[PDB]
Structures are given as structure tokens and as C-alpha cells.
């Protein structure tokens, strides 16, 4: 009678999660497999390159929030993995340096469009803490495994058969996830954002999330020349230095579910335990000599910013849902922008720091620049209270 529509509801709420889940993990992927191959076909512009990919995707975003506010969620999605699938096979034969300057700013309007949707898709359908603490859990979940697994396992594949090939493939199965996401989902007005600046506590979430991904913006391009001028510096585990960074992550993200779920006190806190940990983490980072220590640091780093995007997301649709009128455009894009600030930052800017400073001297600026965020969270204290 009733439970006949109530299972159904639920297989169509966990096969909209695995299916966004893995549109997520291919677009993760997508982002950390190009960075070694265009170095390879060039004939700070590089860093233009990526910076443009990130600044596109600072612009569209405040462009984009009334769309996703205004309109429905399946739409936006479709146009980012369809944005997604138009710039991957644009990176299938992308030949000259426009090309994949054009690709690349394809694929930030794509993150625009699908990931900030995907990510309110998956905090819309639970309305309720232990089970939207869970979801988001396993969404940050498959993009950690994307960006913190797939780049070693892409680069393999590169290495004896050529980019013609999978990437077709991979594109090929994003359009496949794209078409069974149209087969299967089948298709109020809401809070402006230009108050939501104004708004303080949006404000405090995002400048920690732009602190928590700081270091991933000044490290990844960063720490492959460090390796060759200090360390050993063997290829296999020049390589796949973050492939091991990738199980801590896991157990972060276990850990603050169950830390929010028996606990509704303690996300705050466990969220400054994790810029703590990401500080710490920084500032480790000169002391390595050897290859392991260097590895466990970076694991550090993985599982501070673990708790830190597990316990700040959810209280983040969480505030939305006690101050503003329930829809999750505007917001999650607030939290895009606080990725793109930092990824837009990043690529120009640290070559010429260190170069110019030196990398113990930003690695503990880095470190002093967590650690000085720390005290902000300090007026978390009056959320569970409403
Ligand atoms: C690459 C990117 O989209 O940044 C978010 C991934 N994270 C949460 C692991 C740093």
C-alpha cells in the first residue's frame, strides 16, 4: 500500500546519490589527470592556464546562483556534465595551445554548473542531520577518491597508449552516467546572495573553506620541484606521492559522521580541530628530510581537511535552513567561490614565492595562516541553540 512507494522513493534517492556520486569522482578525476600532459605540449602562461580554469569558475558562480535558485536541480546538472562532456572531448584532440586554453576554461564552466548543483542535489534530498551528514560524507568520499587516487591510475594508462584513447572512453562513460541520470530522474523563490556577504556566519564557513583548500592550491604544483632539489626523489614514488593520502581522508570522513552523529555539539569544534591538524600538517613540511615523513604530512593534511569540509557542509545547509528560505543555489556556490579564490590563487602565484621567498618561509606562513584562522571559529558557540 504505502511501503510499496516508500522503497521506491528510497531506490530513487540512493540512485540519484551513487549516480551524482560518480559524476563527481569523473570530474575529480578529469581535474587531476590533465596537469601532467599539458607541460608535455607546449610547442607562468601555464599558470595562466590553470588560474583561468579557476577564475572562470569565480566568475560564473555569482552569475550562477540565481540559476540554481530560480530554476530546478536535474537541469543545471544536465548542462554541467553535458558542459563536462563537450570539454573532454574537446581535451580528445585538443592540439594546439588555444585549444586547451578553451578546454580548460570549458571545463571551470562545467564545474560551475555541475558541481555546486550536484552537491546541493545531494543536501537536498535529506532533510534531516544524521542522514544529510552521511550523504555529504559519501559525496566528499568519491571526490577525495577522484582527486586523491585517480592521477596515478590515469597517468598509468597515459603512459603506453597515448590521450586520444581514454580519454574518449572516459568521456564516453560521463555521458553514459549523463544519459542514465536523464533515464532514471526523469524531469518556491529563494534567498539572493548578494545580502549573503552581508550575512556573517556564511562569511566565517566560507573563509575557512578558502582556508582549508589553501594548502592544495600552494602545494600541488609546488612540492614535484621540491622533490627533485631536496629528497630522492624516485619516479614511483614521485608519482604517486598522493596515492597514500587517500585511506586517512576516509577515516576523517568516519570520523566526523560519527562525531555529528552522536554528538550535535561538535561539529565546530571537530572543525577546528581540523584547521588544527591542516596547521600542523603546514608546518611539518620543512622538518621532512626523507620520503615517509613527507607522506604521513601530507596525510595529515588530507584528514584535516576531511573534518573540516565533513563538519563545515552540512552546518552550512544547516544555517541555511534556519535563516533563509530552503533552496541550495546561492550557497554551495558561496562555498565554490571559497574553492575558486584559492585554486585561482594558487598556480601563478607560489612558483614565484618560492622562487622569489622560499618554501620553508611559505610553508610556515601557510601554517601560520591555518593556525591564525583557528580562532575564528571561536564564535561557533550559538548555532545549536536555534
Ligand atoms: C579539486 C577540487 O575540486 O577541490 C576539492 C577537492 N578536495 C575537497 C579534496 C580538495
Redesign the pocket.
Given at each position: 500500500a504505502e511501503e510499496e512507494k516508500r522503497k521506491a522513493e528510497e531506490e530513487k534517492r540512493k540512485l540519484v546519490l551513487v549516480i551524482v556520486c560518480v559524476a563527481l569522482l569523473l570530474?575529480?578525476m578529469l581535474?587531476?589527470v590533465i596537469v601532467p600532459i599539458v607541460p608535455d605540449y607546449i610547442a607562468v602562461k601555464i599558470g595562466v592556464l590553470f588560474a583561468s580554469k579557476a577564475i572562470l569558475q569565480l566568475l560564473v558562480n555569482p552569475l550562477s546562483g540565481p540559476f540554481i535558485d530560480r530554476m530546478s536541480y536535474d537541469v543545471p546538472l544536465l548542462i554541467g556534465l553535458g558542459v563536462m562532456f563537450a570539454s573532454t572531448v574537446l581535451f580528445a584532440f585538443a592540439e594546439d595551445y588555444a585549444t586547451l586554453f578553451a578546454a580548460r576554461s570549458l571545463q571551470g564552466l562545467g564545474?560551475a554548473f555541475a558541481?555546486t548543483s550536484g552537491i546541493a542535489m545531494i543536501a537536498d534530498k535529506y532533510p534531516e542531520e544524521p542522514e544529510r551528514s552521511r550523504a555529504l560524507g559519501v559525496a566528499?568520499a568519491f571526490?577525495?577518491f577522484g582527486?586523491?587516487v585517480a592521477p596515478p591510475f590515469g597517468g598509468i594508462l597515459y603512459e603506453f597508449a597515448g590521450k586520444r584513447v581514454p580519454f574518449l572512453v572516459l568521456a564516453a562513460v560521463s555521458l553514459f552516467d549523463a544519459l542514465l541520470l536523464l533515464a532514471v530522474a526523469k524531469p518556491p523563490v529563494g534567498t539572493p546572495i548578494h545580502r549573503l556577504m552581508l550575512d556573517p556566519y556564511i562569511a566565517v564557513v566560507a573563509g575557512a573553506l578558502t582556508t582549508c583548500?589553501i594548502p592544495?592550491a600552494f602545494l600541488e604544483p609546488t612540492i614535484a620541484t621540491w622533490m627533485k632539489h631536496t629528497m630522492a626523489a624516485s619516479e614511483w614514488e614521485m608519482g604517486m606521492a598522493w596515492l597514500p593520502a587517500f585511506v586517512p581522508?576516509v577515516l576523517g570522513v568516519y570520523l566526523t559522521v560519527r562525531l555529528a552523529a552522536r554528538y550535535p555539539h561538535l561539529q565546530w569544534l571537530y572543525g577546528a580541530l581540523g584547521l588544527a591538524v591542516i596547521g600542523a600538517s603546514s608546518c611539518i613540511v620543512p622538518a621532512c628530510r626523507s620520503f615517509a615523513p613527507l607522506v604521513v604530512s601530507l596525510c595529515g593534511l588530507?584528514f584535516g581537511?576531511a573534518l573540516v569540509?565533513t563538519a563545515l557542509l552540512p552546518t552550512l545547509a544547516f544555517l541555511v535552513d534556519v535563516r533563509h528560505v530552503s533552496v541550495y543555489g546561492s550557497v554551495y556556490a558561496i562555498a565554490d567561490i571559497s574553492?575558486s579564490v584559492a585554486?585561482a590563487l594558487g598556480p601563478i602565484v607560489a612558483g614565484h614565492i618560492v622562487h622569489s621567498l622560499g618554501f620553508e618561509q611559505l610553508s610556515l606562513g601557510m601554517g601560520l595562516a591555518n593556525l591564525l584562522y583557528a580562532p575564528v571559529l571561536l564564535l561557533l558557540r550559538n548555532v545549536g541553540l536555534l
Open positions: 570530474d575529480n581535474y587531476m564545474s558541481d566528499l571526490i577525495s582527486s586523491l583548500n592544495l581522508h588530507c581537511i569540509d574553492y585554486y
